[PDB]
Amino acid sequence: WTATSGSCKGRCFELQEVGPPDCRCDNLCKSYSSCCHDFDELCLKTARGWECTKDRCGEVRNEENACHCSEDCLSRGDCCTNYQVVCKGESHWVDDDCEEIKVPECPAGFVRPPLIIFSVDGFRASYMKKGSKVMPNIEKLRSCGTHAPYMRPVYPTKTFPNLYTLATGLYPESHGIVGNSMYDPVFDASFHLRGREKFNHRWWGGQPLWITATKQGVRAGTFFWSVSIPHERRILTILQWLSLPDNERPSVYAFYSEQPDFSGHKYGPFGPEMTNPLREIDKTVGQLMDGLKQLRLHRCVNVIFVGDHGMEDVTCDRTEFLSNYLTNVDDITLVPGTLGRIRAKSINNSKYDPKTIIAALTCKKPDQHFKPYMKQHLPKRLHYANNRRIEDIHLLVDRRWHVARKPLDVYKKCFFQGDHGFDNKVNSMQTVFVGYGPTFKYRTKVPPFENIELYNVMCDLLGLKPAPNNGTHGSLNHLLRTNTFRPTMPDEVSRPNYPGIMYLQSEFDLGCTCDDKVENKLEELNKRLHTKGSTKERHLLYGRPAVLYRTSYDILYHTDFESGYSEIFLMPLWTSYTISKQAEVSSIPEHLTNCVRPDVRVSPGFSQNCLAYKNDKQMSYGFLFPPYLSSSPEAKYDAFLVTNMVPMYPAFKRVWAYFQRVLVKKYASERNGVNVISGPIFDYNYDGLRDTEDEIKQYVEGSSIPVPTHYYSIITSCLDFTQPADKCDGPLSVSSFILPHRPDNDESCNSSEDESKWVEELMKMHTARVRDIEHLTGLDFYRKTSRSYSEILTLKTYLHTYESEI
Numbered sequence: 001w002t003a004t005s006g007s008c009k010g011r012c013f014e015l016q017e018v019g020p021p022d023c024r025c026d027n028l029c030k031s032y033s034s035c036c037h038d039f040d041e042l043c044l045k046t047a048r049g050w051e052c053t054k055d056r057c058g059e060v061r062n063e064e065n066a067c068h069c070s071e072d073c074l075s076r077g078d079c080c081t082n083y084q085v086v087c088k089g090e091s092h093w094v095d096d097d098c099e100e101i102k103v104p105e106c107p108a109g110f111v112r113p114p115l116i117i118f119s120v121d122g123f124r125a126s127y128m129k130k131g132s133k134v135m136p137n138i139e140k141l142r143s144c145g146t147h148a149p150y151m152r153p154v155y156p157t158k159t160f161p162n163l164y165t166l167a168t169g170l171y172p173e174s175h176g177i178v179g180n181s182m183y184d185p186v187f188d189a190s191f192h193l194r195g196r197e198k199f200n201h202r203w204w205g206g207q208p209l210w211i212t213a214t215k216q217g218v219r220a221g222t223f224f225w226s227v228s229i230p231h232e233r234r235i236l237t238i239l240q241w242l243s244l245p246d247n248e249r250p251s252v253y254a255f256y257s258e259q260p261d262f263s264g265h266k267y268g269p270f271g272p273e274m275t276n277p278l279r280e281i282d283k284t285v286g287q288l289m290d291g292l293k294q295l296r297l298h299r300c301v302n303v304i305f306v307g308d309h310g311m312e313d314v315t316c317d318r319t320e321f322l323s324n325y326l327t328n329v330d331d332i333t334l335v336p337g338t339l340g341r342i343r344a345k346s347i348n349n350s351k352y353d354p355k356t357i358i359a360a361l362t363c364k365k366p367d368q369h370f371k372p373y374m375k376q377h378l379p380k381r382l383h384y385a386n387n388r389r390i391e392d393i394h395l396l397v398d399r400r401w402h403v404a405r406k407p408l409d410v411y412k413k414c415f416f417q418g419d420h421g422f423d424n425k426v427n428s429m430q431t432v433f434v435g436y437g438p439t440f441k442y443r444t445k446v447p448p449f450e451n452i453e454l455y456n457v458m459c460d461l462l463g464l465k466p467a468p469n470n471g472t473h474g475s476l477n478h479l480l481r482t483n484t485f486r487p488t489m490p491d492e493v494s495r496p497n498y499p500g501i502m503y504l505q506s507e508f509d510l511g512c513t514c515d516d517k518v519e520n521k522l523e524e525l526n527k528r529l530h531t532k533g534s535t536k537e538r539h540l541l542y543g544r545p546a547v548l549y550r551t552s553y554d555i556l557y558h559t560d561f562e563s564g565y566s567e568i569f570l571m572p573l574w575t576s577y578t579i580s581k582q583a584e585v586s587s588i589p590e591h592l593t594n595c596v597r598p599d600v601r602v603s604p605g606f607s608q609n610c611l612a613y614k615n616d617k618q619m620s621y622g623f624l625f626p627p628y629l630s631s632s633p634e635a636k637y638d639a640f641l642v643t644n645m646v647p648m649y650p651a652f653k654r655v656w657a658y659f660q661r662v663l664v665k666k667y668a669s670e671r672n673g674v675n676v677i678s679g680p681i682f683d684y685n686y687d688g689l690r691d692t693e694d695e696i697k698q699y700v701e702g703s704s705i706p707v708p709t710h711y712y713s714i715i716t717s718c719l720d721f722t723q724p725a726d727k728c729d730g731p732l733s734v735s736s737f738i739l740p741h742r743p744d745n746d747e748s749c750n751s752s753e754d755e756s757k758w759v760e761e762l763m764k765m766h767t768a769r770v771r772d773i774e775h776l777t778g779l780d781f782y783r784k785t786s787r788s789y790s791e792i793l794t795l796k797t798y799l800h801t802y803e804s805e806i
């Protein structure tokens with residue numbers, strides 16, 4: 001109950017909302033049925049439209065008009081945006097040539113250049129090029145400022161998750177807004193688009209920019225706009241706020257457009273009906289910039305033009321029905337559409353079994369357009385698991401499709417030709433970024449980057465210290481002329497040991513054998529040299545990775561590879577080797593098929609043992625440095641050391657073998673050599689972060705050997721592929737992956753075929769950033785290069801997506 005009998009006279013778009021039951025006059029009162037009786041009349045005027053006409057010029061101020069063309073309007077802050085053009089001979093901002101903004105050119109009293117976030121719903125990246133002829137204001141921002149070819153959204157590529165990621169820097173799993181609809185079991189409550197629960201603060205985690213600003217004494221424009229307030233009124237209200245007195249004027253402002261998303265849902269991304277919404281957005285941009293130029297702010301403010309996600313072609317007829325797969329379809333609740341999330345209809349049904357639902361949804365139809373996963377088995381790059389609001393069962397839906405429970409759910413709901421939500425590496429989901437202003441560079445293109453990075457930059461732009469977030473602060477310093485943040489490398493926490501030969505073979509009782517007794521100081525001082533790190537500059541190109549937690553580990557050197565061997569996990573944390581373009585693939589000689597050799601540098605009590613593998617009927621083993629890539633028959637003996645061994649399910653050894661035997665060589669041929677770093681990951685609580693030893697849920701039977709949840713590889717070469725990887729003078733090129741260490745290949749529907757028909761498609765789906773691997777290992781890579789740290793941070797955030805060109 002609001003006593004809605006106060007009045008908005010003098011309070012229109014007041015910046016501190018008032019506490020019940022005083023009625024409200026802020027830009028959100030409509031949305032709480034809480035506006036003063038006179039809000040419309042005083043605050044939402046519309047008389048005479050939005051533009052000055054020649055015969056309104058110098059008019060006498062009439063307070064009823066939506067905007068003014070009177071002589072006093074400039075200093076009242078309330079002219080129509082085209083006032084100076086119509087009435088004072090000025091040009092529109094879009095008609096002026098752009099000129100570099102080397103310094104903020106601001107009115108006296110401005111402590112810092114304001115930021116204006118101009119956000120557009122459903123603005124797909126390819127609109128920047130494909131609609132360029134009808135978006136002249138946007139094209140000018142783009143080409144005069146700083147722009148990326150596209151900006152990657154977060155998964156799922158829905159509205160609320162992505163806008164709240166822009167606000168916080170966080171993955172949805174950490175901010176809490178994990179879809180446009182959710183159920184939280186702890187609250188026993190649901191969050192929905194229509195309705196009131198979504199206003200409760202308990203849904204919204206992390207610290208959004210407007211709160212970060214406020215706490216640090218920067219004032220924020222009440223960000224968000226009741227949907228019926230027209231765009232023109234939003235722009236005029238921003239422009240008015242910008243005329244406030246110095247002590248009351250905000251430094252950060254937001255504008256949001258529901259277009260082009262709204263039309264895209266109806267017409268598809270490239271419907272002929274989409275040209276008009278794109279014109280109308282561009283005209284709103286022009287009204288802002290014209291209005292800024294009137295207030296002499298057009299070379300003062302930083303403007304960000306940003307989208308939340310793209311839009312794909314999706315129609316009712318491309319719907320898969322869980323009723324064509326499940327007999328038990330009424331015992332489940334589906335969150336449906338461009339993703340699926342399944343839970344039990346009822347907590348009291350102990351006959352509900354996730355294992356059987358997953359099995360019934362796995363590879364059941366030739367062209368099945370969705371793939372089921374337990375959330376911990378989703379690709380790690382999605383960072384979509386560590387929230388109680390994310391259901392254990394997930395369906396990743398193919399682009400262009402929907403999933404639904406039963407056909408009645410669709411025809412008793414074709415209405416629509418566009419949707420979004422799919423995998424955030426899909427091209428049609430990509431969105432836009434442009435920054436224009438004194439703090440952004442001039443006419444600069446930057447590489448694609450993820451929207452999780454922007455919160456840090458927006459903090460940099462306002463002089464704020466960002467709250468902890470999932471950006472990598474400094475990775476977007478190349479967007480900025482100044483205000484850059486100067487990050488430093490984390491300190492190494494554990495220093496390694498460098499063990500020499502300390503154990504005699506007979507001290508080991510590991511149940512390992514090798515046909516190796518088959519026995520000249522030409523090649524004896526030589527192998528001594530190799531075990532002391534004579535070849536280390538070949539196989540360790542960017543320095544050793546730094547260990548950023550407390551542990552006990554050893555550096556081991558070999559002719560062909562170098563490893564950091566964990567005495568706690570009994571296996572390498574990392575293994576580093578270089579494969580030149582010229583290198584050759586060999587086979588494991590027959591006599592050496594089951595050979596495992598004790599490492600006389602490493603105690604038996606810190607070694608794996610072959611007997612546990614024998615007794616463990618599910619678990620086999622592989623090697624991190626592959627025997628197939630040995631430089632010589634003699635060096636190959638090093639690859640069978642028990643310290644190079646790691647636990648592998650037979651199903652996973654198919655993947656791993658194909659990667660090591662076939663793909664590494666292919667990459668070296670294509671990239672002119674590659675440096676590889678491989679190793680295990682343990683993420684049993686699926687939080688994206690390295691497990692401690694007390695979090696491991698599975699061991700090789702009868703032993704303390706922990707079973708990895710994943711295996712990673714980082715593959716680095718020269719960006720200039722005319723230079724070989726081991727003699728690169730400039731920028732690097734990386735691709736990486738985090739493969740799930742699974743006891744079956746159910747994920748790959750074509751897995752009974754040869755590895756050449758399915759392993760690469762799996763690896764592509766499990767592409768990763770080096771930063772993702774950092775979080776999962778507590779390692780810090782690329783510590784010694786000739787490159788600036790900022791450029792290295794950029795490299796560590798790169799994702800190789802395998803999509804074609806936008």
Ligand SMILES: *[C@@H]1O[C@H](CO)[C@@H](O[C@@H]2O[C@H](CO)[C@@H](O[C@@H]3O[C@H](CO[C@H]4O[C@H](CO)[C@@H](O)[C@H](O[C@H]5O[C@H](CO)[C@@H](O)[C@H](O)[C@@H]5O[C@H]5O[C@H](CO)[C@@H](O)[C@H](O)[C@@H]5O)[C@@H]4O)[C@@H](O)[C@H](O[C@H]4O[C@H](CO)[C@@H](O)[C@H](O)[C@@H]4O[C@H]4O[C@H](CO)[C@@H](O)[C@H](O)[C@@H]4O)[C@@H]3O)[C@H](O)[C@H]2NC(C)=O)[C@H](O)[C@H]1NC(C)=O
Pocket residue numbers: 170171173174175176202203204205206383386387388468469470687688689775
């Ligand atoms: C992406 O970036 C983010 C941001 O940096 C990273 O997330 C952080 O990771 C930290 C490590 O997991 C985590 O730190 C923990 O915080 C606990 C207290 O946190 C509360 O206060 C903060 C501060 O304001 C607040 O942000 C938190 O918010 C979470 O929960 C609220 C309420 O539910 C939500 O609104 C909000 O969305 C947010 O949810 C997300 O995080 C939680 C985890 O906190 C998840 O469970 C959710 O699913 C969701 O993902 C909190 O309100 C603190 O209590 C923890 O301390 C334990 O461990 C330390 C180790 O140092 C130890 O000293 C203590 O003993 C303690 O143990 C005791 O508790 C254990 C667990 O209850 C118990 O088992 C023991 O037996 C002990 O009793 C810890 O410090 C930090 O909160 C989050 N921050 C955010 C915003 O998520 C994220 O890791 C990055 N991701 C990647 C991939 O890099």
Ligand SMILES: CC(C)c1cc2c(cc1OCC(=O)N1CC[C@@H]3CN(C(=O)c4ccc5[nH]nnc5c4)C[C@@H]3CC1)C(C)(C)CC2
Pocket residue numbers: 117119121159160163164166167180193194223224225227254255256261
């Ligand atoms: C989430 C919110 C806190 C937020 C943060 C930030 C921005 C904008 C922000 O919110 C803009 C805004 O005013 N609205 C957000 C959108 C929702 C979704 N919707 C719908 O019901 C809706 C809209 C489109 C849809 N597509 N598919 N389902 C849909 C559902 C109406 C509703 C309109 C209001 C900036 C980017 C400026 C910075 C950070």
Ligand SMILES: [Ca+2]
Pocket residue numbers: 612613614615616617618619620
């Ligand atoms: Ca076995």
Ligand SMILES: [Ca+2]
Pocket residue numbers: 682683684685686687688689690691
């Ligand atoms: Ca973990």
Ligand SMILES: [Cl-]
Pocket residue numbers: 156158178179180181335
């Ligand atoms: Cl959703």
Ligand code: NA
Pocket residue numbers: 745746747748749750751752
């Ligand atoms: Na399979």
Ligand SMILES: [Zn+2]
Pocket residue numbers: 122159261262265420
């Ligand atoms: Zn939408």
